[PDB]
Design a protein around this ligand. Sequence first.
Ligand SMILES: [Cu+2]
Ligand SMILES: [Cu+2]
Ligand code: NA
Ligand code: NA
Ligand code: NA
Ligand code: NA
Lengths: 620, 620
Amino acid sequence: ASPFRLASAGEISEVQGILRTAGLLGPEKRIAYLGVLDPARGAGSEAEDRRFRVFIHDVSGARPQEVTVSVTNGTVISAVELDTAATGELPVLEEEFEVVEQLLATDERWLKALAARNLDVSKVRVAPLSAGVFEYAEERGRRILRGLAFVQDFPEDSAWAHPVDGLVAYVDVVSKEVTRVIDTGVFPVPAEHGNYTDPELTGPLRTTQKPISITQPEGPSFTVTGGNHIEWEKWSLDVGFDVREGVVLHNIAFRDGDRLRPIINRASIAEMVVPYGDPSPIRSWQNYFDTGEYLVGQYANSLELGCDCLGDITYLSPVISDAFGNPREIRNGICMHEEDWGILAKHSDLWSGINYTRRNRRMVISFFTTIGNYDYGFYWYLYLDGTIEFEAKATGVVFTSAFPEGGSDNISQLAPGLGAPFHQHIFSARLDMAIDGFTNRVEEEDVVRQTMGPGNERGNAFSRKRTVLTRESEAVREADARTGRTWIISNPESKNRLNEPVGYKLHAHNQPTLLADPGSSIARRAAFATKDLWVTRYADDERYPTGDFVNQHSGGAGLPSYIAQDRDIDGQDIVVWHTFGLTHFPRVEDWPIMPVDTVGFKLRPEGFFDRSPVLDVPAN
Amino acid sequence: ASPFRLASAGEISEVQGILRTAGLLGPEKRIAYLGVLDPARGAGSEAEDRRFRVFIHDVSGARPQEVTVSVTNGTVISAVELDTAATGELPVLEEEFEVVEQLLATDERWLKALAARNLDVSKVRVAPLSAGVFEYAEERGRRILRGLAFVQDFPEDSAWAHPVDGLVAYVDVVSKEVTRVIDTGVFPVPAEHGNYTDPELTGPLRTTQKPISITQPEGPSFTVTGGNHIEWEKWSLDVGFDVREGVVLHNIAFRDGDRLRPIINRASIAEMVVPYGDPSPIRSWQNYFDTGEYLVGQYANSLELGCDCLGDITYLSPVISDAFGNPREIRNGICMHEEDWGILAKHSDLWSGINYTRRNRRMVISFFTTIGNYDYGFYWYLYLDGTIEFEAKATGVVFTSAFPEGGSDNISQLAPGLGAPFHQHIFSARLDMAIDGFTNRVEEEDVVRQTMGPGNERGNAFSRKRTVLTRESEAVREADARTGRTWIISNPESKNRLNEPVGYKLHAHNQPTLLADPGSSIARRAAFATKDLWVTRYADDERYPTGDFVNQHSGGAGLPSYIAQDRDIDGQDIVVWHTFGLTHFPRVEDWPIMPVDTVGFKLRPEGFFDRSPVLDVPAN
Ligand SMILES: [Cu+2]
Ligand SMILES: [Cu+2]
Ligand code: NA
Ligand code: NA
Ligand code: NA
Ligand code: NA
């Protein structure tokens, strides 16, 4: 009965029928995105209306459409034709992944380039790569993918070990035309294989690892009700799933005595971009918005018990739409479990004689997605002490190139003749805050050093300062690790027992933000990535930091346009957008398959509670 | 037979006898420090000589002594009388912890101060606090402790909830004289209790936590030989224990195929300091060198199975000396176990059809120490992929004060009338590096941003630069999170298969360093804490960043004096000293007992291996 329940197969089938009956889902139509809309502000009406938003592509060249449907009432709420030269192209379709390779295989320019390299066209894989917006005037308003080639020596071979450098092609996937083939010269195709399951490469497998058995003989400590509502160790929340964003957390609250206290209304990773830093014209256009262009939720893996998730696991299997509106289940796509997390609190007192130890634990909600060469794990953690943490785990296979004779300032060498271009993986977390309710504000907190002198005669004092962000035009902030900078989200109308406003502190990892030149195409299209923290006033239609249609959008959509409204954010319904990322100079140890590297952020209570919230944890 | 074996009870008993027979351990003598010396460079002689270093205090006022003893030969190697006004006082003795309270209880000035506050002297606990070096000329060459008072309402009461502010005393613990009693005014003693085991404060204990069972039905994957030699998943190392430093790791090496490759010769936390930032004269002198002044190893806890260490645990029980030279076992003082650590590597490939998942694990070596109000866990982690990580876990009870009416810029309020002064916890890791042998160098690596223009026409390129540190005078470095700064330790004479020098990259957390004014006493005595990274040339006697005798030392000992030698460190036997710490503005949630907070660092291979070192991990 909850409005935040996962989409059902029946709901998706009804959407299909509504669209079909309205004449919106003919044979030339494809669904590029379908998702449930969240309830509007003021859901205390109990009048449920389950609405779905749909992006509809047309493979014959007609204008695409954005459609909103009510499954509760069986009606089309609105349908708008999109001018894609203005507002952006629709996300990449899974069925387009093979179209680039197929169109190039019959193009004489492509074939002549492969012939010069003595490459069999049947062995050449072409990656379907988003195009961005650069100097090519003929691409405006056309649906373009770019292709880079990799050789597979046999069907089970890792093509990533064999990049074909000096060659790139651009394809119009609707008109089925190859617009440009660019061949800058012949590079040797690296010959070593990268087959990490080949015994010749792994050697004999270790026989030294003994089993670790993690079991819960009384079952888990959390309960799941209504399909996706979690209660665990005073936490309460709803686990949603969206095909663009992936796992979304709703209604994060903490039961403090008799009161359920809200903390976060909605938490998601609302964008992620992978900019490459190789200036070669073969790759200098590469910036993959894995979320906004490809939709990370639709490529979520089915997670295997014992391998991907270990322990007493509870699965959710979210349902999404395929390109024709049929429901499709991602079996075991979300893992949920609790984990021991070491010592929570400990003290042995010299005067009272009391020895005290308590153990910590965390609740884990996770999924894994695969986008071409990349594989990303998204982990949300809830801790006993009120801490909330997000962690991204990056693995998969690095994107490769030739390594130029004489070296490179922008590419790492991994194997003889094999390179990996420098790049970043940058995430945007969208945190619709609700600290004890919706009246919130953000303060920037810096350490303050003090000069030795009167009132500080021994030169030991230090302090802190807090600056309230009052308007959106002043709420675009940068990290400063040297001054210990953090941000506090507080509720000025809700005080703790010491009469101080309750709050939560955001702790960033302070990694570099977007490195590209500020005049670049990617700096305009991924403006969110140039700053660590943005605060906006909540609005229904301000969902993504890059706007609704990221593919081939010319730039400036999303956060820079939102904050131009300069709205009041001092004790208001606000949204925090936190940029964080990994800067990846690939190492030899990343090849042929990359060990996990991680990045994230956390929020800790800051005077939210009247004392430690874990005094009632028992002694194991 | 290994020279790196733990000290035995028999060795300590022999040291006792050697000292006694030489006339060095009469009734007025106390052992303030005793530890085994590491083998000198060039231990390939197999001629074992187990030597111990001893600091001997004299309770009658005679000069203390530093003594070196050979237990193998039964001889005193050297004995030097110490002029403590010059070189520093000896570490605090456990038996002095009660002496401050006892001496003050008979001093008329102290009693009159307690009488004005209507405090029963029998209920007043006095903390034995190290003195530092300030303006009091009469303290030079005298062994001074300072005392701050806390009320215990009954024997099991937490005295920390009841600080007696406005009052401090200084005591000469050898002459047994109270030198000064300073009373700046009457503050109310905070009345709320902080008894975290009192049901009136905890409420009913949770009944919602179900058990997590972690077992290893075939036993652990590591082996322990010779008492303290560990082999685990290609790692090899020796676990040492020293009463000053605690757990020390020796001979960290990795078996790469047929070769055992050294990485780190010796790893330890060689100092830790807690500076307070409250300018009140009652506390503005407070800077506790928990390692150098108090010796964290002697206060290591006995760790309980199921509570402190969970899973299949292997314990070590190190032996230390008491103040009279008797051996004393710290039962179950070190826990060792392996832990599952999630996903190691994962990829599902669109072209080969291969789905691949491997799990990670880590080896954990840990101990916990208690120094007055503080409790610290020290954790070393070894990962399958070659990563080495240190983590400190800070818990216990925050050091308290009154909260002044009208507020404070340097103290947090925790409860009515109860404050907690701002402070830092700053650690120094001493890493005697041995990357593939002893010829090492350090490079500082910064991200390099590039301007849009010729050769970078789309403004996307970025790069990195490495600067070799060639002399000690240029090897004092600061963090720069914004430029992604890291440090690489490499071996210029050992190349990987791509002909690049092998290396390891140090990743810091980039937390603030020492905040005190650079002209302060603590900035001179804890100079190491003012910079993130120091590199020195190895020398036998350069053990601690603060020098050998930290207590009441006037300043500048240790690292600033060492680097003045300006030795060559470019391809030499070098030692990296990394400063890292927590800046603690206490929150209400830290009271009455503090949930764990953490800080640390890690080292990851950087072209050390010829490819990923975990290709031979099996599929669970
Ligand atoms: Cu990467
Ligand atoms: Cu602290
Ligand atoms: Na446009
Ligand atoms: Na909000
Ligand atoms: Na001196
Ligand atoms: Na060394």
